[PDB]
Design a protein that fits this description.
The PDB classes it as transferase. The entry lists the keywords Phosphatase, transferase. Helices cover 51% and strands 11% of the residues. The protein is α/β, with parallel strands linked by helices. The protein has a single domain, classed as 3-Layer(aba) Sandwich (Rossmann fold), CATH 3.40.50. Strands 1, 2, 3, 4, 5, 6, 7 and 8 form an 8-stranded mixed beta sheet that branches. The longest helix is centred in the last third of the chain and has 21 residues. It is globular and about 75 Å long.
Length: 396
């Protein structure tokens, strides 16, 4: 809703969302979580504590230092866990699904859910399932999780060329150059430190970036404290621009990545198609397949699907934010749903929802948002073929 929330990017909480299908194919990111790393917090504290020792803090800086120490105590032992908000986000997603399509989850419908080995994903799965079971205890439920699903849910860890690109690829200097251009650390640090001009540009920038990082994740934690007012709206905008680019180039369809970050997702697109074909043919009789994973799962998956906008290949870094927006693709609890329908002539239609809003594909249909499954499957198999050919060039 608000521009300020949007600028949290992938850390934005899941936005407000207040015939009948025969099958639902789902992928969801875990819900709102605690920060995963204490690195940024420790950086901020270390700078403010060192300043306090040399009498370099303003009044606001002292108050910030106390706030940071408080957060350090609250975050302790909570790193990476799903928060209460994260649980409620999943309940809302499950609740709207049951309310919108009750016939599908009626009687003794069968559902399967899988998750990664990461606890926040498993807990997200469980918040979702508990809501399904609460609404219909007569559901048949298969629940599993773990590294057995790495190939489809954590492909971003398994591809050596991609891991290399992620850690040291040519996207790196472009990001750093972009940050230096967009983020002016002095006016921000002036609020907290006496003589902020004494700080070297690199330390000043690392401090400011770490502070943004702490402020951005705070709304996902359910802790009733807020740090958005540490920065102006313009500074948030600029920060978001940098993180948006970082995500785009490291995880999506940026020309610098050569579609490597997108191509690695094909086994999941392949598995989505297989689960659907098995239900359609009667080989499986599941009414829904749910999958719980990560932003790094959702982003290239959505790009590989070719949902309009999300796989744009933008050559100019400053243009990326106009065309590709991470908070529309992968907020907390980001999810893709394929809803399958059978018409009166037994033709199969599919509707794609991205965060519960109809998505477009670059194929035609006479009845948007519904697409012919036949056409859609053909398009998706071409995407998988393109993925494999891309991967054949970076054969590790």
């Amino acid at each position: 809703q608000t521009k300020i929330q949007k600028y949290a990017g992938t850390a934005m909480p899941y936005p407000n969302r207040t015939m009948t299908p025969f099958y639902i194919n789902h992928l969801g990111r875990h819900g709102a979580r605690f920060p995963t790393s204490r690195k940024a917090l420790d950086k901020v504290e270390k700078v403010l504590v060192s300043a306090q020792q040399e009498n370099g803090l303003t009044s606001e800086g002292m108050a910030l230092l106390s706030m940071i120490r408080r957060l350090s105590r609250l975050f302790d032992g909570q790193w990476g866990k799903l928060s209460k908000l994260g649980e409620t986000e999943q309940e809302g997603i499950a609740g709207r699904m049951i309310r919108n399509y009750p016939q599908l989850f009626s009687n003794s419908a069968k559902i399967e859910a899988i998750a990664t080995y990461v606890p926040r994903s498993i807990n997200s799965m469980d918040a979702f399932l508990s809501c399904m079971i609460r609404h219909n205890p007569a559901l048949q439920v298969q629940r599993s999780e773990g590294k057995q699903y790495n190939h489809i849910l954590r492909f971003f860890d398994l591809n050596k060329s991609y891991v290399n690109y992620k850690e040291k690829g040519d996207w790196l200097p472009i990001y750093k150059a972009f940050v230096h251009k967009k983020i002016s650390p002095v006016p921000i640090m002036k609020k907290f430190l006496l003589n902020p001009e004494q700080y070297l540009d690199k330390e000043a920038e690392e401090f400011v970036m770490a502070l943004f990082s702490v402020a951005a994740i705070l709304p996902d934690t359910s802790i009733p404290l807020n740090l958005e007012d540490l920065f102006t709206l313009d500074e948030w905008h600029r920060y978001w621009q940098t993180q948006n680019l970082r995500q785009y180039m490291s995880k999506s369809s940026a020309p610098v990545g050569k579609m490597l970050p997108v191509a690695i997702a094909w086994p999941l697109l392949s598995e989505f198609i297989r689960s659907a074909q098995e239900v359609i043919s009667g080989k499986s009789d599941y009414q829904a397949n749910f999958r719980f994973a990560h932003a790094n799962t959702v982003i290239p998956f959505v790009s590989l699907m070719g949902i309009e906008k999300t796989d744009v290949q933008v050559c100019r870094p400053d243009s990326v934010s106009v065309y590709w927006k991470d908070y529309e693709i992968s907020p907390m609890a980001a999810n893709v749903q394929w809803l399958f329908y059978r018409d009166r002539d037994q033709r199969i239609w599919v509707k794609i929802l991205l965060n519960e809003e109809a998505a477009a594909l670059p194929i035609s249909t006479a009845c948007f948002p519904y697409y012919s499954w036949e056409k859609t499957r053909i398009f998706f198999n071409q995407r998988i073929e393109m993925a494999k050919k891309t991967l054949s060039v970076f054969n590790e």
